[PDB]
Every structure is written in C-alpha cells, then in structure tokens.
Design a protein around this ligand. Structure first.
Ligand SMILES: N[C@@H]1c2ccccc2OC12CCN(c1cnc3c(N4CCCc5ncccc54)n[nH]c3n1)CC2
Length: 494
C-alpha cells in the first residue's frame, strides 16, 4: 500500500521532466494543479510523451477528466492499476508509479523546526517511541532525527546529505529521507550500551486543547513569506492505509443501487438490510461516560430505485433523525430523489408506510415530521425528523459556519430528546464530502459537549478514524479549514 506517486511540490513542467528522464512508458504521477488551485492533475507518459489529465473536486468527489468519479486519489489510482481512455478514445496505461522523494507530507517530518522547539514538544507530548525529523541549522542541507526512550531521555541522530543521498554517518545510503526512516524503523539503531532507538510512532503535534482553537487556527493560517496545507496533505498521504474491500458494492446485482459507480461502501461497516445492499456505512466514533453514544449512517442521495431500501434501513436501524445537506437539483443535475411525501400526504414505499405529518420552514433548512410504520403491522410506528439543509453553496463551503452550527445544534437536541434513538442518518450526493464534514463537525463538538472547553481534540486523527468507515469522508481542504472554523466558532459562543 503506497501513495508515493503523489508529488505535492511539483509543477507541470517539473513533472514532464521527471517522467521523461527518470521514467518510462506507462509511468505516472499525481500532483496538485498549479493553474487551478484546489484541483489535481494526473501526468501519464505515452509513446515518449506526457499527458496531463485534470482532476476536479468541489467537495463531492474526485472527478477525473474523461474518466470516472472517485472518493480518494488512492482509490482512483488503484482502480486503474488493476479502462482509462483519452477523450479521443485512446487507452491510458497506469503502469509504473514515479515515487516522490519529497518528505513534506510525512507525519514525522517537521521542516525547519528548531532543536529547542523540538525538545520541548518531545518532552511534553511524547512517549516511548515518539520520533521526528527536522532540518538542521548548523549543517545546512542535513537533517536531525530525535527519538524518545524510557528514567526517560531524548536521543539526537544526525542525517547527512551527500551527493543527493542520506545516511546516519555510516551504513547504507538512501535515495530519500523516507527510505532512510523506514529502514531504521524495521532495523532500529542500537547504541553500544544497549539502548535501542525504536521508532514506534511519530510525535503528535496536532492534538490541541479545545480552548486554544483560535490560536491554533492562527498558526495554521500563516503565510510562508500555510500550515493548513501541510496538516491536510499529510493526512491525504495516509489515505493509502484505508483501502478496505468493497466487494458487495461491486456485485453485478448491486451496480444500479449506487449513485456513483466507483464510490462504494466498505464491507466491514456497510449497513446489511435484513436484497441486503444499500450504499451506506455505519459511523461509530472510536477514540483512545453515562450517556448513550451517538452514531451515524453516512449514505448517498436516494435513487428512484433505492427509496424503498432507504426506508427499510431507517426502520431497521431505528433511526429517528435524518440530515439532508443537498437540494434535489443543483446546477441542473439530480443529486437526490424525493423520498418523502408531500406535506400531510401518505405514501407507501414497499412494505414501509410514511406520512409527512408537518413541515417547518426556516431560511437555511426545512424540517419535516414523518411518521414511519410497517405496512400491515400496527405496533411499529415511530416519528422520523428530516432536517433538510438547503443553503449549502453549489461549490466549496459556506463562508461562515453560523447557519451550519445552529442547524446541527437543533439536530443534536432532537436526537438527545428521543429515548432509544438509533443512528443519525446523514446523506448528501455521494455521501462522503458534505456528509463527512457534518459528521466530523458533529463528533468534534459532542466531545466538547461532554468534557467542556478544557479537553483534547485531534481533527486529523478524527477524520482518519472516520475515513476507515466510509471512503473519503471529508473531500477537500476547504472542508478541512471549515471544520476548524466550525469548532472555533462553536467555542466562541459559549
Ligand atoms: N509533514 C508536515 C510538515 C511539513 C513541514 C513542517 C512541519 C510539518 O508537520 C507535518 C507533520 C506534523 N503534523 C501532522 C501530523 N499528523 C497528521 C495527520 N494524521 C494522519 C492520520 C494518522 C494521525 N494520527 C494522529 C494524529 C494525526 C494523524 N494528518 N495531518 C497531520 N499533520 C503537521 C504536518
């Protein structure tokens, strides 16, 4: 499982040179789009030439130009390595990934961190095994590896840069900082007196106290003359660890139940309907109390032939709340089929019977009180509250988290008020972009709800934990910053 084919600091011209001199026909790489920030590019080599295929993402998915829509770049790349065609019909071959040697996106690489700033972090945040790599000041071009062991101590090892190859003063000589680190993780260094410098896990510098969210947002926003980009791209590199199987979704008899062909649900977290398939996953927050914990069901916008399966899941999971964060139509394109009856009306969706009891209209969202019951069974009725957010921009995210927070605050209070309420159903278009931003924002403030302003939160660690339960939760970096902005705003209104 690799993601080294993504080059975060390369230009289009630098990519053509890399592919023509250090690659062969079939070699490929991915990079951020420089002419159109927020987008990405897939540089592939063919018949001695290089092709640049664009990849756009406004918050819903990764749209490959002339290709398909994917939940993650790794999932996109894996899909084609096991037909991608130009818009002229020619077949593209993604054969040999061109590995990147830039360590910017590594969890343990901290750039120009100082030795004093490093020793401080390693002493107050680190445990046995915590390690990090920083740039050297007294020896420009070199790097410094600091490991903590323990009664406890911090050990500093120098990394020399000689002729574009790295070494720790002796032994083997590696082509990249990453190769050197992995080698000494599998084969840790040992001092003559017995001390083993075990590189267990990288020092955590993203966990913050909820109180200092504003000062942490200020830091991640500074100009080079941005930290958000470093924190985010370092998280995107970790997505190659989340390639769980999606067999049931790929089955022939389930293809037409997916809104997007390749955006499929994980097998180990998909909702099994007790004719068992639906593009949805259970999101159970896991972290390292007397109140029942809240779970979620991230799913896609209903298709005309999946509305019956949607209400079967809602009834089966005992869900009492539904969060819709998209219009039925956006930019003249269908994003979710109407799965609820007109106000005061009564419809039958297969064996399920739904009545739209009442609709309450605000500017940002509409609320519908639906009464769900199993046809032919009297003692099965229950109320289901559908919160339909309608003011989310077509592209990007809202400029202010105000409306979204008041929206989710009401959603939280309706759930808390219903005894034995099942998971909260949250859907969108593909159910990964906006649906991921809402669930992540809800999980993060629920932690603050129960522990207070003085508690520890880890935005990246939380997103990663949620991404292992549905492909590509939280799509873009704009939704990333918006998550920090939301947690920061919610804290300022207390
Ligand atoms: N390499 C970046 C960089 C470049 C230049 C200078 C400094 C600098 O620091 C870096 C490294 C440190 N830091 C982090 C650390 N961890 C993550 C992270 N994960 C992903 C899933 C596993 C995980 N588990 C627990 C916590 C976080 C995470 N996602 N984003 C992150 N960012 C900021 C960015």
């Amino acid at each position: 499982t690799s993601r080294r084919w993504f080059h975060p600091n390369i230009t289009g011209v630098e990519a053509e040179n890399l592919l023509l001199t250090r690659g062969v026909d079939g070699s490929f790489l991915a990079r951020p789009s420089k002419s159109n920030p927020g987008d990405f590019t897939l540089s592939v080599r063919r018949n001695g030439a290089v092709t640049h295929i664009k990849i756009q993402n406004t918050g819903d998915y990764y749209d490959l130009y002339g290709g398909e829509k994917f939940a993650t770049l790794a999932e996109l790349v894996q899909y084609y390595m096991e037909q991608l065609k130009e818009k002229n019909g020619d077949v593209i071959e993604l054969k040999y990934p061109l590995n990147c040697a830039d360590p910017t996106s590594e969890r343990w690489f901290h750039g120009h961190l100082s030795g004093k700033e490093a020793e401080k972090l390693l002493t107050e945040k680190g445990k046995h095994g915590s390690f990090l790599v920083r740039e050297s000041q007294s020896h420009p071009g070199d790097f410094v590896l600091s490991v903590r062991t323990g009664k406890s101590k911090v050990t500093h090892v120098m990394i020399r840069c000689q002729e574009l190859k790295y070494d720790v003063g002796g032994g083997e000589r590696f082509d990249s900082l990453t190769d050197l680190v992995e080698h000494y993780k599998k084969n840790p260094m040992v001092e003559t007196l017995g001390t083993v410098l075990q590189l267990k896990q990288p020092l955590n510098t993203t966990r913050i106290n909820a109180a200092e969210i504003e000062s942490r947002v200020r830091e991640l926003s500074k100009l080079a003359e941005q930290g958000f980009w470093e924190e985010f791209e370092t998280l995107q590199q970790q997505e190659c660890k989340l390639l769980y199987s999606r067999k049931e979704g790929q089955r022939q008899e389930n293809k037409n139940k997916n809104r997007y062909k390749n955006i499929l649900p994980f097998d180990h977290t998909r909702v099994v309907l007790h004719s068992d398939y639906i593009n949805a996953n259970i999101i159970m927050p896991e972290f390292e109390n007397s109140k029942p914990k809240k779970s979620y069901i991230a799913t896609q916008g209903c298709l005309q032939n999946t509305v019956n399966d949607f209400w079967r899941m809602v009834f089966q999971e005992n869900s009492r709340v539904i969060v819709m964060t998209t219009k039925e139509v956006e930019r003249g394109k269908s994003k979710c089929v109407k799965y609820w009856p007109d106000e005061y009306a009564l419809k039958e969706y297969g064996v399920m019977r739904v009545r739209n009891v009442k609709e309450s209209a605000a500017h940002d969202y509409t609320l519908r009180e639906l009464k769900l019951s199993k046809v032919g069974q009297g003692n099965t009725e229950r109320t289901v509250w559908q919160y339909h957010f309608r003011t989310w921009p077509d592209h990007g995210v809202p400029s202010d988290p105000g409306g979204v927070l008041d929206f989710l605050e009401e959603v939280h209070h309706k759930q808390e008020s219903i005894m034995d309420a099942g998971p909260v159903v949250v859907h969108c278009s593909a159910g990964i972009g906006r649906t991921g931003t809402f669930i992540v924002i809800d999980i993060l403030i629920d932690i603050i709800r129960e522990k207070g302003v003085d508690c520890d939160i880890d935005v990246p660690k939380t997103i990663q934990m949620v991404r292992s339960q549905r492909s590509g939760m939280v799509q873009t970096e704009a939704q990333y910053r918006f998550i920090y902005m939301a947690v920061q705003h919610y804290i300022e209104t207390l």
